[PDB]
Amino acid sequence: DDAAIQQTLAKMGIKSSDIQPAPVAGMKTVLTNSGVLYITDDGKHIIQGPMYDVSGTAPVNVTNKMLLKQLNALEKEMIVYKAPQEKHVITVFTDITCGYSHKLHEQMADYNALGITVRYLAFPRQGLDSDAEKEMKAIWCAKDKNKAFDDVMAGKSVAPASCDVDIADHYALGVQLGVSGTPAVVLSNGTLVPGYQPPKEMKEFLDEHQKMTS
């Protein structure tokens, strides 16, 4: 039943995969640390995502849509910089050794002033064994994540704390959404918008997008 899928995944070195329904008859969504896969219910065929629903007006990435639950499950681990008057909420995969992640953060006050709330998730482009990952682990373990994040970004060191937060979970969700470089923005609907955008351009881009969807 699922025994066929798990037998296939195990035999291919992908057993710890999370299985979910797929919007296609006879196929299931398979979440792995290296990306989402689609496999038939008989476990005989696999196709690497993403999957697009092209029935509507504009093609939608159902893979990233489905991943919104995964994203929402990590809401507690996100370092949130809420705008006073929240007009938009974007999720950002950031890397502390990325000059552009820095440029983006140095302007947090301006994103917030335009009603843009930013929620951070770690994504060390250098991998899970780099110093980037250790540092960020330390940040995400602090009592005050926002201040630790601010300090590190500002050049100050942080105390290597140990906690229940696995940067590996952040990294994996990112790769599942198609993140390869930093910083990468994830919209409310799952759409991945790689790269940094100044406050004004981001604001404008977000507004125009609200119309595109609605």
Binding site: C98, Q126, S180, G181, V185, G195, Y196
Partner: protein, 118 residues
């Protein structure tokens, strides 16, 4: 933040060897650049006479600080002192894009042709 192409399209790596003379090259797409500091060359069954990093331009980023970068193209002369059959060079590099994007480091393996010593 616009259209960010794959790393191999943004930084087209290649090499050319003529005995003791080797050239590592990168065709760097308009709007992209490589950090001079992040280039690492590691020999395998070979000895490097030397690596002549060309002079690059002025760039300042929030992390690495004031760094020298390369645009358009980078030709890295590398003279091979000696190399036996199967020798190789592991070349790692990192680049980014003006539009606000940093790519993960890249690693290429260069198969060297045998080269002699006395």
């Amino acid at each position: 933040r616009s259209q960010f192409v794959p790393a191999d399209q943004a930084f087209a790596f290649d090499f050319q060897q003529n005995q003791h003379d080797l050239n590592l090259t990168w065709q760097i797409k308009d709007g992209y650049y490589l950090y001079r500091k992040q280039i690492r060359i590691t020999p395998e069954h070979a000895k490097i006479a030397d690596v002549q990093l060309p002079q690059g331009v002025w760039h300042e980023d929030e992390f690495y600080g004031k760094s020298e970068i390369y645009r358009d193209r980078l030709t890295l002369p590398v003279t091979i002192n000696q190399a036996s059959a199967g020798a190789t060079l592991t070349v790692t590099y990192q680049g980014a894009a003006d539009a606000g994007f940093c790519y993960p480091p890249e690693t290429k393996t260069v198969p060297l042709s045998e080269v002699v010593a006395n």
